[PDB]
């Protein structure tokens with residue numbers, strides 16, 4: 001069958017499933033952005049923009 | 057003049073009586089008579105908390121807060137003698153009343169600040 005490094009080639013001639021895979025990728029990335037923001041808000045100390053700003 | 061059933065649940069019970077704009081007069085004090093405050097009412101509108109200074113030892117400011125314990129904040133039904141002093145000054149000596157309320161306010165970021173808002177032994 002297909003080697004492991006070729007599994008996604010099933011999408012080349014399947015525009016609908018390619019759109020699905022792209023939707024899933026987009027869902028993952030947007031989910032990352034959301035999760036990352038939440039984790040940052042759960043750890044961020046807003047009490048000192050002078051000596052403890054976000055980049056520290 | 058309003059009854060309990062007029063006031064119940066409106067939030068008016070936590071407000072102090074007001075006087076109209078026409079009330080810019082003068083109440084004569086007779087240094088020979090004894091005086092009393094029959095009712096003192098204190099209705100807070102703002103609670104400010106002093107920020108715990110970063111470490112600059114610069115000006116730490118009082119900042120706004122959000123009241124989270126509802127319309128439970130006012131001091132009222134406070135009474136005490138109103139002394140007339142030698143120098144013509146008046147001294148109110150609080151004796152009794154509903155002279156404290158526990159109050160919780162919330163700082164930006166979530167920190168809750170409980171306080172015993174009071175004038176005990178004023």
Ligand code: CLA
Pocket residue numbers: 002004006007008010011020021022024025028
């Ligand atoms: C954007 C991500 C993405 C998307 C949209 C797809 C989509 C697709 N894959 Mg591919 N795949 C991916 C990533 C992805 N894959 C990764 C990272 C691997 C290595 C594990 C694979 C390996 C793979 C194989 C072997 C096969 C596919 C196949 C397919 C198709 C059918 C679905 C399937 O069987 O998935 C299977 C893939 C998975 C179930 C992904 C693994 C899940 C990982 C472990 C993360 C799970 C999240 C987890 C909850 C978080 C863990 C947190 C941790 C800190 C503990 C479809 C085109 C099939 C295909 O059609 O072959 C012709 C197929 O046989 N994929």
Ligand code: CLA
Pocket residue numbers: 004005006007008009
């Ligand atoms: C938009 C970017 C993009 C897209 C859509 C594709 C899509 C494709 N690639 Mg190409 N490729 C890319 C960029 C991309 N590639 C980059 C940047 C490189 C260099 C690193 C390559 C090098 C490359 C090679 C050498 C090959 C492909 C192949 C393929 C095809 C099969 C993929 C597969 O089934 O893997 C299945 C993959 C797995 C089952 C697991 C992979 C696990 C990886 C290595 C580690 C974990 C990755 C992690 C989950 C991703 C994090 C996201 C990242 C951006 C930070 C498919 C058409 C194959 C092909 O042409 O088939 C005919 C093939 O041989 N790609």
Ligand code: CLA
Pocket residue numbers: 015018019022023026
């Ligand atoms: C009306 C014309 C039109 C419009 C507005 C779009 C718009 C888009 N296309 Mg293209 N496309 C078109 C014509 C169009 N296309 C035609 C005629 C073809 C040949 C069939 C294609 C083939 C094509 C492929 C193969 C792919 C796209 C993809 C995309 C998306 C990429 C960006 C993205 O996902 O953002 C992020 C998304 C958002 C911020 C949300 C947007 C909200 C959507 C539009 C509302 C959904 C409801 C709507 C009624 C149903 C779908 C609308 C559809 C016209 C796109 C974007 C929504 C890619 C995709 O879907 O990636 C996931 C993709 O893989 N298109």
Ligand code: CLA
Pocket residue numbers: 008025028029032
């Ligand atoms: C411009 C931005 C961008 C681009 C071009 C891509 C492109 C890609 N992404 Mg997405 N991704 C992005 C942003 C992006 N990503 C962001 C911001 C997030 C949230 C963190 C993700 C989360 C994400 C997930 C969870 C997955 C992808 C996957 C993919 C691949 C799908 C096509 C494929 O089959 O490749 C085949 C794979 C390759 C060609 C190998 C790519 C190798 C990368 C570039 C470096 C790998 C590093 C190292 C070897 C392994 C990681 C270290 C390990 C300790 C974790 C493709 C390379 C999917 C994929 O890799 O499926 C197999 C996948 O599962 N991405």
Ligand SMILES: CCCCCCCCCCCCCCCC(=O)OC[C@H](COP(=O)(O)OC[C@@H](O)CO)OC(=O)CCCCCCCCCCCCCCC
Pocket residue numbers: 002003004005
């Ligand atoms: C965030 C979520 C992330 C989850 C992603 C999951 C990641 C999965 C990673 C897959 C990696 C698997 C590698 C496949 C490995 C594998 O299948 O190899 C053999 C494979 C052979 O492919 P063929 O075309 O012969 O097809 C056979 C098929 O059965 C394969 O499916 O060739 C490759 O894949 C090319 C890569 C070469 C790799 C060679 C390196 C090995 C040499 C030893 C190196 C170590 C020793 C060094 C000493 C100094």
Ligand SMILES: CC1=C(/C=C/C(C)=C/C=C/C(C)=C/C=C/C=C(C)/C=C/C=C(C)/C=C/C2=C(C)CCCC2(C)C)C(C)(C)CCC1
Pocket residue numbers: 028029030031032035
């Ligand atoms: C369904 C639904 C829902 C929900 C959702 C959700 C809840 C979500 C999510 C999500 C999510 C929550 C997600 C996420 C994600 C993530 C990710 C995607 C990640 C990733 C990662 C990575 C890729 C990594 C990598 C790496 C490492 C690990 C280490 C170092 C290096 C690197 C960086 C490479 C709602 C209700 C709205 C509605 C409708 C339905």
Ligand SMILES: CC1=C(/C=C/C(C)=C/C=C/C(C)=C/C=C/C=C(C)/C=C/C=C(C)/C=C/C2=C(C)CCCC2(C)C)C(C)(C)CCC1
Pocket residue numbers: 032035036037039
């Ligand atoms: C319609 C319906 C339904 C549905 C559902 C759904 C749609 C679901 C889903 C779901 C989902 C879709 C989910 C998910 C998920 C996820 C996950 C599992 C994740 C993750 C993640 C992570 C782990 C992360 C992390 C991180 C990052 C990335 C950054 C920052 C840091 C941290 C570490 C936090 C049901 C059945 C209910 C029933 C009725 C109807």
